[PDB]
Structure formats: structure tokens, C-alpha cells
């Protein structure tokens, strides 16, 4: 699924937020506007088999630029919680749900 992180009107927020893919989507994150971006899962708010490391952005680095894009495929079923670092505390978060 193409997820636009910002709303276009700089607003921070990940389009959409809380959702819902199959087992094994390949959900697309792209530099709306609000940037910069980045998509970190949080570690206890994803099921184990899945390490972070494997489905975060490196905290290192970040989508600086418009237009960039990050790319990750859920395989496991499970609640995966994410958040834009840079702007967690604006409430830059997510939910996707692998059914
Ligand atoms: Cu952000």
C-alpha cells in the first residue's frame, strides 16, 4: 500500500495512520510534504519473529528531500506500530495491521 507521509498541507501526519494490509504487503512510505520523514517501528509494538532493525528506517538516516521514498514488506501477521522520529512528539505516528 502507498502510505503519503504528510497530508499535503504540511500537516504531520502519515496518510493514512492506523490501517490494515495482507500478509506480506509492500507498503511504500513517500515524502509528501511536512518532511523531513522517516518510518521507525516501535520495538515492543511488533510481533517478535520480526526484528525492528528489519522493517525500521535507520534512526541515522532520513527522507531529507520531497519525493524520496522508503519501501517495507510485512510478512508476518501481527499489530506493527510506527512513528516518524523527528516528529513523534507532533504526533507523527501509525498503525498498520498484518492480517
Ligand atoms: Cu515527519
Same mark, same amino acid.
Given at each position: &500500500? *502507498?502510505?503519503? &507521509? ?5 500537516? &504531520?501526519?502519515?496518510? @493514512?495512520?492506523?490501517?490494515?494490509? @495482507?500478509?506480506? *504487503?509492500?507498503?511504500? +512510505?513517500? %515524502? %509528501?510534504?511536512?518532511? @523531513? =520523514? %522517516?518510518?521507525?517501528?516501535? *520495538?515492543?509494538?511488533?510481533?517478535? /519473529?520480526? $526484528? ?13 528531500? @520531497? /519525493? ?6 510485512? $510478512?508476518?501477521? /501481527?499489530?506493527?506500530? +510506527?512513528?516518524?522520529?523527528? =516528529? ?10 498484518? %492480517?
Amino acid at each position: &500500500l *502507498e502510505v503519503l &507521509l504528510g497530508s499535503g498541507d504540511g500537516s &504531520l501526519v502519515f496518510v @493514512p495512520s492506523e490501517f490494515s494490509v @495482507p500478509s506480506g *504487503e509492500k507498503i511504500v +512510505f513517500k %515524502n %509528501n510534504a511536512g518532511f @523531513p =520523514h %522517516n518510518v521507525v517501528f516501535d *520495538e515492543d509494538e511488533i510481533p517478535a /519473529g520480526v $526484528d525492528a532493525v528489519k522493517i525500521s528506517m535507520p534512526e541515522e538516516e532520513l527522507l531529507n528531500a @520531497p /519525493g524520496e521514498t522508503y519501501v517495507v514488506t510485512l $510478512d508476518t501477521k /501481527g499489530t506493527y506500530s +510506527f512513528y516518524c522520529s523527528p =516528529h513523534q512528539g507532533a504526533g507523527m505516528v501509525g498503525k498498520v495491521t498484518v %492480517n
